[PDB]
């Protein structure tokens, strides 16, 4: 989370100004006035949360789910994007299905020996699996996935015959996806949309015929199984193609949409008869939520020639062949505000009344439960590692988190900065805005922190707007991978309040390849010390989405969304998951701390695991990397930074005594507040163990250096604030969130403030 | 903004930082002209040797609001 | 519960409480319940499941190898 001036936001978060979504900079800040209105309505739904396992499992093969998986891993994987992955899949499909000699060997690994298929007899000496290893001996995939699926295909056609014997199970986790963003991602979605039928044709048709030729009872089959399989499988590859270009089909349908949206001349492009409203594309006229796609479309590219245009087509088929209707992906689909139904909102602020502090945010989780495991692997190959939870720690650490959910009630937490608003009087107001006030998005942090990219660097990248060109396919674009969502954020809850629309193409002087965002008249109070666009007249019109909110009521969020950990152990007690690795090793930390009793050190430390009381050291337990909370606590941390900076500056001059004590008074309980909650972090499960062992180490150190004489230090306040805050902070260190610098900075905060109490306790 | 700047000037010397002391009544109208001065020169209209005149004429009278605001 | 009282008689495993607070600290029963346990868990205590050189006996036989002068 960060902040920016309202009047100067283009001079501030210039990239974030939506005008930036277009190549606009100019003397002019886009906008103007023009024409055609329609609230763009019905946005694609909420891909957030909803994490769960899925089962690849059966060779009966559902292409659909597998597609979902492809996009899933693709975003989650080591190789963007889905597109190239689909190419690679087709390559593999050639190398396998279109490469018959393999199949001879496969049947050879099955019943193969001599005079196959050993007449009418059964005998299916196979785990599904053993086939999988044999294919693993064949061409490696960077991303096997389908390497399972091809086996699944082997099962599907060998299912009618007596080789159902192997049947085990296969499992894989989801992966959270954003708003969801970029049209390139849609490109992935449409090629995947092809995969739905690029694959299913081989996933289906198949054969009920041949049992195993029958030929009572059925049947002998030399290479004939491999024969009938592959040659048909290759044939299935032939009908598969999808023909139609990925980026092209989206480019065109987007073209027709955006120029439909055009107030300035559609010209030869136009609404027409069967050119449009073909009992579906008009439903897209209702799906105008995917707006922004046109934005980057001109931005990522430029002119959007329909090139395979035709005029019968399309219409005809291509818009019909649009992805969401083929429904792969976290492409999701829904009405309006439900995606906004996780938007916080607090006008706060006063007298002016509008501007100095108006925050937004999101309601969120703390299902405390979090898990860890051994990576058992019945056979070496890749990462098909079975794992079982480690409940003995897994519960109590989660139990350790139980108060913590009552702590940092993020909604209530927002109230914190809102409370700051009255600081500092008195009223400005025209001379210096206004303020960002608003963003502090848990979502933007988690989206990037999930890849451990650290979002915070991306933040400033949206401050200046321009990307800092960290040229690497998993570096630079990933930053931008967020920025899209970031824009995608405000627009959606800029829908509600208000369905005001349009705007114009804003050609400027260069160059008319198209350039049209959206406008929002909303409705207003009669005073405008906020927004460069003075246009108070009745209401702002308005060029940029945020100002609507800037003129918006606090409304106070409905907002309920809060995720949940997947059950995992109940299934991986049977079957392997594959986001692993990712989840990592993973066991810090040795948090030593000093106690400077008069002119002496007596630093102590402790070896994580026995805080849990378990013994001894564990080597290979594997905690996840829980998300969500990181964003909260970070926001909490950084916002404290905003806090003490503001207040300290206030006492530095404002000015005028009646206020200074107020803030410096204010300051105190702020810290005092945190003080209190920090004990809840610790001495209440399980950091009491921490203070316990610390006392042990320190007194025993007294004895070891000799005297325990001075060692009254199990006592009061100063040492107690020391050890306690250290403790809760410490289990918090054992918590996988917030590093360490936050710790020293935190004690840096309390240390001037006062500490006093004596609150303990 | 100009008020923001001179309030910043109040922060110049540390004792005349004692909050705003301009605002009562006369000052507001007295600086109200300044808006008419930006509207004057380099609004793209008036040519100076003008506010000059206006200054002397605004000195000619009590002005005040004269009421309103 | 017709057994934990036998543990009331097995209070020999004293010292376990000693290091228990020492090795650790507070001994919250956490899965406490109140029906449980009782119920099953003390029943499910080890010595009754008899693994180990956990061994079991009356009093002094373990002392019956103590010299004294």
XYZ file of C-alpha atoms in Angstrom, chain A residues 12 90 124 145 210 219 262 277 326 346 350 374 533 552 570 646 650-651 703 746 756:
21
model
C 2.249 11.098 -9.140
C 1.206 -30.587 -29.731
C -2.957 -57.260 -17.013
C 1.116 -33.157 -16.800
C -12.960 -54.305 -30.865
C -8.751 -61.040 -28.842
C -17.001 3.760 -30.446
C -26.735 -9.492 -32.617
C -16.032 -22.672 -24.266
C -14.197 4.421 4.172
C -14.229 15.850 7.668
C 7.352 -35.255 4.998
C -11.161 18.479 -13.413
C -18.095 8.743 -3.122
C -7.100 -36.718 3.776
C 2.915 11.738 10.086
C 3.104 16.976 13.230
C 4.900 17.598 16.482
C 25.183 -19.927 36.840
C 9.107 -2.802 15.640
C 6.155 2.362 30.235
